[PDB]
Amino acid sequence: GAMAPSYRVKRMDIAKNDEECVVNAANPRGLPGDGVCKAVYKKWPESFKNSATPVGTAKTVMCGTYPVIHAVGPNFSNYTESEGDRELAAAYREVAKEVTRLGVNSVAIPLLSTGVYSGGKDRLTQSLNHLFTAMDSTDADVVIYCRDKEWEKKISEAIQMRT
Ligand SMILES: [Cl-]
Ligand SMILES: [Cl-]
Ligand SMILES: [Cl-]
């Protein structure tokens, strides 16, 4: 575990992370996809061997010795708000299990279901709160990656609020 487990936020490409493993915002079929998933495919393509997994689950595939945790959030275009909320919570619980099993001291993680799976809604608070519910009992350093300047400020605020 980390000596003083922390949360941090960085605004940059998660393919350039400085952590011991990465969480991919994957699709259920293990396809290259777009956004975070396409960046992850360009950096760690070997990790997409047999990466297909259902909504609400995470499946880890090694790229060399570097673990890529494929976490499948719901597409809110297809799920009801209620069922989507349950699947998004479940995907993060499976990420916490994998991070624990791998014995890493740090993990790079995007906000699941906030991009093309958001069904056109701002889900920063919803996705971040499910991330915290899952990861708070882990002792890995968690570094959250985003691309938007206003999202960076809001995520940083939410982390600092609890400190
Ligand atoms: Cl960048
Ligand atoms: Cl997304
Ligand atoms: Cl973002």
Give an account of the 3D structure.
It is a single chain. With 163 residues, the chain is α/β, with parallel strands linked by helices. The chain has one domain. 34% of the residues lie in helices and 20% in strands. The chain is built from four helices and six strands; from the N terminus they run ββαββαβαβα. The protein has helices spanning 36-43, 81-102, 124-135, 149-162; strands at residues 7-11, 22-25, 58-63, 66-71, 106-110, 141-146. The strands form two sheets. It has a three-stranded parallel beta sheet, covered by helices on one side. Strands 2-4-3 form a three-stranded mixed beta sheet, sandwiched between helices. A hairpin with a 2-residue loop joins β3 and β4. α2 runs parallel beside α3 (124-135). One chloride ion binds at residues 25, 113-117. ADP-D-ribose binds at residues 13, 27, 35, 115-117. Residues 4-163 form the Macro domain. It is found in: Host cytoplasmic vesicle membrane. It comes from Chikungunya virus (strain S27-African prototype). This is Non-structural protein 3. It is classed as viral protein.
Shape: globular
Describe the sheet with the most strands. Answer: 3 strands, parallel
Distance between the termini: 19 Å
Total strand segments: 6
Bound molecules: chloride ion
Count up the domains: 1
Structural class: alpha/beta
How many DSSP helices? 4
User: Looking across the biggest beta sheet, what order are the strands in?
Assistant: 1-6-5
Radius of gyration: 14 Å
Order of helices and strands: EEHEEHEHEH
**Helical proportion, percent range:** 25-40%
Strand content: 15-25%
